[PDB]
A = this chain, B = another copy of it.
Amino acid sequence: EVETFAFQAEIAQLMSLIINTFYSNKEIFLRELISNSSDALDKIRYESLTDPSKLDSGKELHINLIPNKQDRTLTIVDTGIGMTKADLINNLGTIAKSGTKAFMEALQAGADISMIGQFGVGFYSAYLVAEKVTVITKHNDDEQYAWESSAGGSFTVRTDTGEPMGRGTKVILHLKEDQTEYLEERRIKEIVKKHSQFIGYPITLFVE
């Protein structure tokens, strides 16, 4: 069963801005997603010090970058803390409303699209390069979900019946037809080397 939800008007606005504004420096989407994964991994690691059983769903704390040309997807996989249904539908959600607003205001004031991360909404930078984003995620306290949006003002969530992931998050970027350079090994290596050099987790770039 697939549930369909309306983004709040402000997030829809933001998504449309990212999609519509002419902005050539798109590569920053990857720094933002890697950094999102890094924060999710910090959080699970932190929680684990006071409750070791939080790691029963897997001990390795890592980030995998997985390009697939047949499918035209770039997937960022982490084993961080994962997201609950309430995060997907409500909490993220509420936090994104105020980051959006602040980010909008700063843009009017000459700030730049690359600064999206300072406003806690870097995940939406994925729409610089993706026509569709699917997010698979498993939190310890909850079941595995698939969230999905091509923007246009709505998203879906359903319980996921794919390969079970243990704990973590997979962001599957369905790339715009003119953004396939982000499937290329030397392009991804360049981008990681330039913006994500000091991430405190191993980042494995899978080959095709």
Residues of A participating in the B interface, judged by any CB pair closer than 8 Å: 42, 45-46, 49-50, 86, 90-91, 94-95, 98-99, 102, 106, 111, 115, 118-120, 198, 200
Contacts and interface: CB of A to CB of B under 8 A. Distances in A.
B198 A90 contact: no
Q: Give the number of times this chain occurs in the complex, counting copies.
A: 2
A32 to B, nearest CB: 15
Contact of A94 (B49, B90, B111, B198): B49
A89 to B, nearest CB: 12
A46 B91 contact: yes
Nearest to A86: B50
A129 B111 CA distance: 31
A7 to B, nearest CB: 17
B49 A90 contact: yes
B42 A120 contact: yes
A45 to B, nearest CB: 7
